[model samples]
Target: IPVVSDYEDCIRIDVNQETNYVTFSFQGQKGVMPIWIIDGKNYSSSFNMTKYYRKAGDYSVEVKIANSNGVSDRAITRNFHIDKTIMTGFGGFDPESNNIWRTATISEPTFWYAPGWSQIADPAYSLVNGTYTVTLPEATSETWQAQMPIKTNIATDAGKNYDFSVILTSTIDHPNVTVKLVDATEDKIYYFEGKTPLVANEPVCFWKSNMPGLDIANLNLVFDFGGNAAGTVMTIESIVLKDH
Candidate 1:
């Protein structure tokens, strides 16, 4: 009698987030022409198979072995989950169409913040050799006062998802900066889901996925840098946005 195996064949499942490919392996099968059925589809007839998924979700796997007599019973695998999905298009900063935030090409943004907050480049902020740096003014008590808004034309649907990634470093610890996708004209806001305290000097490479979509065009990618000590410089190395 053939015995059923555990959910994981030692490692269970290995998922590659960058390539969105998953590897499934079977070690005990000694029969010839081992057929693999992954996610309910007929896959390779080998003991191991690799597959990729464009959509992110929970999935399952199964397999069957064949010998001289006949094919054996199906062996099912535990459901494995994947969170990272394949990003389709480049939806980051596009200065050619209304986005002032330049991507690695230019030094400073086209324009800076709201009124009462002056544009002090050398003292307040500086962008030299594509490395953009911003010095925090005296804490205005309100977080929205030190705003860096980028006007964009990135279209967003009502039922899709978004992915936001950024790399930044701050001079002081716990720089409570907030990133938001907003349509100021229509008055809508979809804040990136977390506010993890930032560390000093160490680069914070962050990724926030599955932001609920909104029906809007020409949205502003705003960075709220309110309430920090005077002359505290923060460097934003990179930022990107992608849609499926």
Candidate 2:
């Protein structure tokens, strides 16, 4: 260790591009040096640490460099994220589009309230605020969704089943929000009709269903805003899908 040196000259960071690693590199004498840690564990920049993050969400790992000098003057810390921008576009077999919320296919959609579905980055779907609803009238409904269907490699699917659930908030006292999973293509299905209904202004509410993963020729969510919910606000607060 070159005793007594500017800390700025000691370290650097590196990322192994799209798939290799989230790594760091530092140059300093092996011994007689500062203590180095990453996410609280002792670290050496000589090798890389690997973690396979399977889910897409906000996450971060940190690094700290501590020394005998002023803790504030000599110590250094850094934060790295496995966030949305970093987690997207991974190779997959499913028909899941890039971001599940970015796009949706339906028979017809009213743009005033929805314009269209959105990605997680949009605060419009936030848990705290930006909650919106599309009031369905007797003649038309803007509250319905259909996911991209499964079309590739059908013979090798091994029969995976379809499953998903969504959270809702109702401004209207109207109850009974019907949800279903269907095949809009050829192999037909009507998975559920009101398997569970929405309550009037049910906060943090949801329901789900499952069926044989039919050919996703045009597999889509078959939820509808109807009946008492007509002419009232029906908010889709959150959605969960198998992305099958």
Candidate 3:
């Protein structure tokens, strides 16, 4: 039988998401070569083995020793869940939230609420002086958002409320601003535009949204900002998401 999840083997189950490697280590009786059995597919063999999982899910690992004494009855079975959805870090090319953000070029763009895109590094989004800023140039088509990552295996059930928010440390009282949280998977939009106080360096709340009744096991929280027109620019220093 499989051991309870999250238990550290006498050896170690080392998992690293950014580097894309899961390392497994073993210790045993003397003069015995450790055998590492993974996934039960007759995967060649090695000791102190490392594996990479391109996707997220459960992977089984077992380790034992073979010796002149035949084999050590002591063996270890472990499970690991590799997750890419977790928001490990943000700001300045952090692989955690970087590259997950995507945008497209926009023309005839609307203001504070619309589907438009911009080319990254356009006047719209650029790492200026090491700060990730998106300036919506006047009359230019531009939009940006990130499909935020979350811990894998955390499923949303009914009656579960998630407080999705952002730290808009540098907001402008410019009446023509909008901030929204969207569920790209289900096409649901929770409006926060002009609802909460737009104070600089202060955290603002959107329409409290529920995480229930979704077919997906994970939440795809997207920060959809910039339906701005000519001269309509907003500076968002940071954004955040939490499971409430």
Q: What are the root-mean-square deviations of the candidates from the true structure over C-alphas?
A: 18.4, 20.0, 21.0
Each model's C-alpha lDDT? 0.54, 0.39, 0.40
Residue 168 of model 3, lDDT score: 41
lDDT by residue (22-68, candidate 3, tens digit) is 66664443444555655442221233544435456777876765656
Write model 1 residue lDDT over 60-175, tens digit each, in one string: 76666555676656475557777876556222332133222343232234334432465443236675644668776454333455667656656678888776666667777643
Candidate 3: which stretches are off by over 4 Å? 1-123, 127-132, 139-155, 169-172, 189-233
When sorted by TM-score, best at the front, the candidate numbers are 1, 2, 3
TM-scores, one per candidate: 0.47, 0.37, 0.32
The lDDT of model 1 is 0.54
Models sorted by lDDT, best on top: 1, 3, 2
Determine which window of 10 residues in candidate 1 has minimal summed lDDT.
89-98
